[PDB]
Amino acid sequence: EGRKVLLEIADLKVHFEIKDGKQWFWQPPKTLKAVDGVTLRLYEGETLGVVGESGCGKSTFARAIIGLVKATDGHVAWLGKELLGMKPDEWRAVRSDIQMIFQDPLASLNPRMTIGEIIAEPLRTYHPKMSRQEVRERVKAMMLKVGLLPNLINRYPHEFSGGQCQRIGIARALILEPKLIICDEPVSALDVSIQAQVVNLLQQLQREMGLSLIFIAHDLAVVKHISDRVLVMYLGHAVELGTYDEVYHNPLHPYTRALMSAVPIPDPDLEKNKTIQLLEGELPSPINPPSGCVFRTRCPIAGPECAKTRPVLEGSFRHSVSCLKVDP
């Protein structure tokens, strides 16, 4: 029943060692618990938005799926094959299907290479027997698809206006005909009108090629437009997971109520009249998360049971929460 399950993630953890100069040389490293206890499944033809404050680990979660950072525990599976135990070579079979778009427009592109080479580098790496003519024609066709003029082929990435650089990044991801593309803050650096060009383009390409996306962003309002489901994160935990109607119109988790009421609205008669929720105290350091529930220091409805045990995602496909004191 339903669409194909494309990617499954269960009990994923990413702990980084940290040994800062404030420790004695004798002492063990501390653990930066960047991600701890994410659990979800992503379907074919679906966009999952991942959203949260700085330090939520959404960028490390992205990097753990595609293999740029080694997961400490859990399982990730693509089309039924496990990813986290894989040898360095068999990752190439999976990366034919899984590709990525990155935070910084200029940094994403090698500054010593032309556009034609940057978009051709995946294609040349996966099809070594393909001719220089076929590679140039594939690249010109993909440039015309992302909205770059074909005669720009021989120009270098410093000649481009930042929004054009994320179009090169999209073209490089799509040249293989992938099935999941992961977007690590694809529109953070860009001007507001250009953000809407890149988001409309990703949403067109999803519909035109049949992709799934994992879309990671800081702006809740951008995430609502492109996503079908949203994962809300706090200090490496999954706090809420549901469809784009439920997570924004019926938020149950206290952090999502705070985050969605803190989102600013582009209407003077609404922004001055909304019921603002406010959180007591700073973001805890991810070098020493609180024991039990990690939101326990900021939560408006806290209680002593939340120090004794740690919540996990419970609920339906439509909506699920990690809280002891609310139930959908």
Partner: protein, 278 residues
């Protein structure tokens, strides 16, 4: 298109100091090459009619004579061969050792980076001129020992800057994107990291050659250095410093070529710094 090394070429040609320098440095190379071959006199020859004389255009001793009755024009050229060949050889050794240590320290990540950069800071606290003098006095002044000894003590800042550049590139996005594009570790090094590390290497190599010419010329001013049949500019300067009361040209000609040469490389290095890293 705006090929970034052709913009660097345009910046280098616009910097008039740097082009001027390169002309000068090539004219010094042509003097150091040709003068012993075009000369009427040899490096080991003597004319006791002119035991020590100032420049005289009818004599053919155009730079005057050393107090053994011996020609300074030929000796300043032959000594320029030694100082430039030791300087370039020592720079090659320091560039290879420094690039290898810096690239491994930067690419292998935190574990190895931590200890390898600790060793540079510790080692930079040794008296390397005393340590090269200790090698040279205990093992006997061979020119091949001086190439290697000057190089093996002067790669530390070269390794520090190549480490900084390599660790920055290993953190950059287009290396993560090359891994996601299925590119092998050898492909990432050869086609993505090396072309971007190469800028720092060319700038610091060009700035390092004059320090090696100075280190040799110091080590040969005290004595030590290279012996009489293979005397460098620093060895001529000490015979000059003694002779200075009677025949001051024995400082001024060696000093002119050495100072000019060191000036030249400094402006070529700053021209490349400006060109490759605005």
């Amino acid at each position: 298109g705006r090929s970034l090394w052709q913009d660097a070429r345009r910046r280098f040609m616009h910097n008039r100091a740097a082009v001027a320098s390169l002309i000068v440095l090539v004219l010094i190379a042509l003097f150091v090459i040709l003068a012993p071959m075009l000369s009427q006199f040899a490096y080991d020859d003597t004319d006791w009619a002119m035991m020590s004389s100032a420049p005289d255009m009818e004599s053919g001793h155009y730079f005057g004579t050393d107090s053994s009755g011996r020609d300074l024009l030929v000796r300043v050229a032959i000594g320029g061969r030694i100082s430039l060949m030791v300087g370039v050889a020592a720079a090659l050794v320091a560039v290879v050792v420094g690039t290898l240590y810096g690239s491994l320290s930067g690419y292998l990540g935190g574990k190895v980076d931590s200890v390898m950069m600790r060793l540079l800071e510790i080692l930079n606290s040794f008296p390397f001129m005393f340590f090269v003098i200790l090698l040279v006095t205990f093992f006997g002044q061979n020119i091949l020992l001086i190439f290697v000894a000057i190089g093996m003590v002067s790669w530390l800042d070269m390794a520090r800057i190549v480490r900084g550049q390599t660790l920055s590139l290993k953190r950059k996005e287009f290396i993560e994107a090359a891994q996601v594009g299925g590119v092998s570790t050898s492909g990432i090094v050869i086609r993505h990291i090396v072309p971007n590390v190469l800028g720092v290497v060319v700038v610091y190599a060009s700035l390092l050659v004059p320090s090696m010419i100075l280190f040799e010329s110091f080590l040969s001013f005290l004595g030590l250095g290279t012996q009489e049949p293979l005397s460098s500019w620093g060895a001529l300067l000490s015979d000059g410093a003694n002779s200075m009361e009677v025949s001051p040209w024995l400082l001024l000609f060696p000093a002119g070529f050495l100072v000019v040469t060191l000036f030249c490389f400094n402006f070529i290095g700053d021209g490349l710094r400006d060109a490759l890293d605005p």
